[PDB]
Design a protein around this motif. Sequence first.
Motif, PDB file in Angstrom:
ATOM      1  N   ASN A  40      31.921  35.587 -19.732  1.00 49.27           N
ATOM      2  CA  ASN A  40      31.715  36.484 -18.607  1.00 49.27           C
ATOM      3  C   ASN A  40      31.734  37.947 -19.054  1.00 49.27           C
ATOM      4  O   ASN A  40      30.870  38.720 -18.657  1.00 49.27           O
ATOM      5  N   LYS A  41      32.689  38.312 -19.941  1.00 47.05           N
ATOM      6  CA  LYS A  41      32.743  39.686 -20.439  1.00 47.05           C
ATOM      7  C   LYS A  41      31.426  40.070 -21.163  1.00 47.05           C
ATOM      8  O   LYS A  41      30.900  41.174 -20.993  1.00 47.05           O
ATOM      9  N   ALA A  42      30.834  39.103 -21.902  1.00 52.32           N
ATOM     10  CA  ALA A  42      29.572  39.355 -22.593  1.00 52.32           C
ATOM     11  C   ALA A  42      28.412  39.608 -21.633  1.00 52.32           C
ATOM     12  O   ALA A  42      27.460  40.278 -22.010  1.00 52.32           O
ATOM     13  N   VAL A  71      33.414  25.971 -32.365  1.00 51.78           N
ATOM     14  CA  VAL A  71      34.868  25.928 -32.387  1.00 51.78           C
ATOM     15  C   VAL A  71      35.317  27.272 -32.914  1.00 51.78           C
ATOM     16  O   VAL A  71      35.040  27.614 -34.062  1.00 51.78           O
ATOM     17  N   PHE A  72      35.931  28.074 -32.051  1.00 50.50           N
ATOM     18  CA  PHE A  72      36.331  29.436 -32.403  1.00 50.50           C
ATOM     19  C   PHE A  72      37.322  29.509 -33.560  1.00 50.50           C
ATOM     20  O   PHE A  72      37.168  30.331 -34.472  1.00 50.50           O
ATOM     21  N   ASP A  73      38.341  28.676 -33.487  1.00 46.25           N
ATOM     22  CA  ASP A  73      39.440  28.694 -34.442  1.00 46.25           C
ATOM     23  C   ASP A  73      39.075  27.995 -35.772  1.00 46.25           C
ATOM     24  O   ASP A  73      38.832  26.798 -35.740  1.00 46.25           O
ATOM     25  N   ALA A  78      32.544  28.969 -34.983  1.00 49.30           N
ATOM     26  CA  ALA A  78      31.846  30.133 -34.475  1.00 49.30           C
ATOM     27  C   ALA A  78      32.412  30.522 -33.126  1.00 49.30           C
ATOM     28  O   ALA A  78      32.980  29.692 -32.417  1.00 49.30           O
ATOM     29  N   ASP A  79      32.276  31.800 -32.818  1.00 49.50           N
ATOM     30  CA  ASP A  79      32.584  32.335 -31.525  1.00 49.50           C
ATOM     31  C   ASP A  79      31.343  31.978 -30.668  1.00 49.50           C
ATOM     32  O   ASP A  79      30.241  32.453 -30.948  1.00 49.50           O
ATOM     33  N   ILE A  80      31.525  31.156 -29.619  1.00 48.89           N
ATOM     34  CA  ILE A  80      30.408  30.724 -28.775  1.00 48.89           C
ATOM     35  C   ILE A  80      29.665  31.897 -28.134  1.00 48.89           C
ATOM     36  O   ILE A  80      28.477  31.800 -27.937  1.00 48.89           O
ATOM     37  N   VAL A  81      30.344  33.041 -27.875  1.00 44.20           N
ATOM     38  CA  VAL A  81      29.673  34.231 -27.325  1.00 44.20           C
ATOM     39  C   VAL A  81      28.703  34.778 -28.354  1.00 44.20           C
ATOM     40  O   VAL A  81      27.557  35.028 -28.014  1.00 44.20           O
ATOM     41  N   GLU A  82      29.152  34.951 -29.624  1.00 41.57           N
ATOM     42  CA  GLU A  82      28.251  35.459 -30.642  1.00 41.57           C
ATOM     43  C   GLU A  82      27.139  34.492 -30.951  1.00 41.57           C
ATOM     44  O   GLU A  82      26.019  34.924 -31.174  1.00 41.57           O
ATOM     45  N   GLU A  83      27.425  33.196 -30.921  1.00 42.84           N
ATOM     46  CA  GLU A  83      26.454  32.149 -31.156  1.00 42.84           C
ATOM     47  C   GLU A  83      25.386  32.196 -30.051  1.00 42.84           C
ATOM     48  O   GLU A  83      24.187  32.178 -30.328  1.00 42.84           O
ATOM     49  N   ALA A  84      25.832  32.329 -28.786  1.00 39.15           N
ATOM     50  CA  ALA A  84      24.897  32.423 -27.669  1.00 39.15           C
ATOM     51  C   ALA A  84      24.021  33.660 -27.780  1.00 39.15           C
ATOM     52  O   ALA A  84      22.825  33.530 -27.616  1.00 39.15           O
ATOM     53  N   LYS A  85      24.572  34.840 -28.129  1.00 38.59           N
ATOM     54  CA  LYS A  85      23.756  36.052 -28.278  1.00 38.59           C
ATOM     55  C   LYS A  85      22.738  35.966 -29.413  1.00 38.59           C
ATOM     56  O   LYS A  85      21.645  36.528 -29.293  1.00 38.59           O
ATOM     57  N   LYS A  86      23.069  35.227 -30.470  1.00 37.51           N
ATOM     58  CA  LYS A  86      22.182  35.048 -31.609  1.00 37.51           C
ATOM     59  C   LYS A  86      21.057  34.040 -31.289  1.00 37.51           C
ATOM     60  O   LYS A  86      19.884  34.344 -31.507  1.00 37.51           O
ATOM     61  N   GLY A 119      39.823  33.954 -18.629  1.00 37.62           N
ATOM     62  CA  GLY A 119      40.263  33.880 -20.015  1.00 37.62           C
ATOM     63  C   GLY A 119      39.604  32.728 -20.745  1.00 37.62           C
ATOM     64  O   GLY A 119      38.729  32.032 -20.203  1.00 37.62           O
ATOM     65  N   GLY A 120      39.960  32.556 -22.011  1.00 35.41           N
ATOM     66  CA  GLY A 120      39.362  31.517 -22.848  1.00 35.41           C
ATOM     67  C   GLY A 120      37.876  31.738 -23.004  1.00 35.41           C
ATOM     68  O   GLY A 120      37.376  32.853 -22.896  1.00 35.41           O
ATOM     69  N   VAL A 121      37.127  30.654 -23.163  1.00 31.09           N
ATOM     70  CA  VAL A 121      35.679  30.720 -23.261  1.00 31.09           C
ATOM     71  C   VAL A 121      35.061  31.410 -22.035  1.00 31.09           C
ATOM     72  O   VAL A 121      34.167  32.210 -22.205  1.00 31.09           O
TER      73      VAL A 121
HETATM   74  O1  LIG Z   1      35.163  38.321 -26.204  1.00 33.58           O
HETATM   75  C1  LIG Z   1      34.750  37.921 -27.296  1.00 33.58           C
HETATM   76  N1  LIG Z   1      35.458  37.113 -28.088  1.00 33.58           N
HETATM   77  C2  LIG Z   1      36.792  36.684 -27.718  1.00 33.58           C
HETATM   78  C3  LIG Z   1      36.848  35.196 -27.477  1.00 33.58           C
HETATM   79  N2  LIG Z   1      35.891  34.367 -27.956  1.00 33.58           N
HETATM   80  C4  LIG Z   1      36.244  33.085 -27.592  1.00 33.58           C
HETATM   81  C5  LIG Z   1      35.657  31.854 -27.822  1.00 33.58           C
HETATM   82  C6  LIG Z   1      36.306  30.729 -27.334  1.00 33.58           C
HETATM   83  C7  LIG Z   1      37.503  30.841 -26.633  1.00 33.58           C
HETATM   84  C8  LIG Z   1      38.080  32.080 -26.399  1.00 33.58           C
HETATM   85  C9  LIG Z   1      37.440  33.214 -26.886  1.00 33.58           C
HETATM   86  N3  LIG Z   1      37.798  34.557 -26.820  1.00 33.58           N
HETATM   87  C10 LIG Z   1      33.416  38.325 -27.798  1.00 33.58           C
HETATM   88  C11 LIG Z   1      32.462  39.134 -27.283  1.00 33.58           C
HETATM   89  C12 LIG Z   1      31.373  39.095 -28.180  1.00 33.58           C
HETATM   90  C13 LIG Z   1      31.721  38.284 -29.170  1.00 33.58           C
HETATM   91  O2  LIG Z   1      32.979  37.786 -28.974  1.00 33.58           O
END
Ligand SMILES: O=C(NCc1nc2ccccc2[nH]1)c1ccco1
Length: 165
Positions: free
Chosen positions: A50-52, A151-153, A17-25, A43-45
Amino acid sequence: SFSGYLKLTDNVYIKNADIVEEAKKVKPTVVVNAANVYLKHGGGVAGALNKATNNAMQVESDDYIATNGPLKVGGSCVLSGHNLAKHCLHVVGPNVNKGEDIQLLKSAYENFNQHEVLLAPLLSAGIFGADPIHSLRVCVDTVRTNVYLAVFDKNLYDKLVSSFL
Ligand SMILES: O=C(NCc1nc2ccccc2[nH]1)c1ccco1
């Protein structure tokens, strides 16, 4: 609440999972950020979290560094989780690409033990340059509290699960 995680041990769970999407959910109590000592979330996580937050995490972090100075490699601080979590635990794993000591990864994971449940990435993985299989091993052997690893990948996630001892 946490769904779709594979149980690795009594207290460690993992999901592709993308930790950003997981956190928003989930809006967990604690989301861990893969921070650097300066809390510069480029960059990275860190960049993604931060962008979220629309850069609110970086603004708060710059005020924290202005007041306290940098964190130690292996250290952490608790800041707001903004729109992602109640709190963000900024944890600094060693960056082996910047020549930092890989033995500090266990110290970095020990920060997780101060929180009963966390949504987290694998420390020092990704752009931090450490072997993610090693990071998962250190996580399972160090963290005693409930850690939900995102784990994003996909390919790395499959490699992590299939090679888990
Ligand atoms: O910016 C986003 N994803 C890119 C991203 N997601 C990571 C997760 C781990 C490491 C690098 C990553 N880079 C995003 C915004 C809302 C949902 O996803």
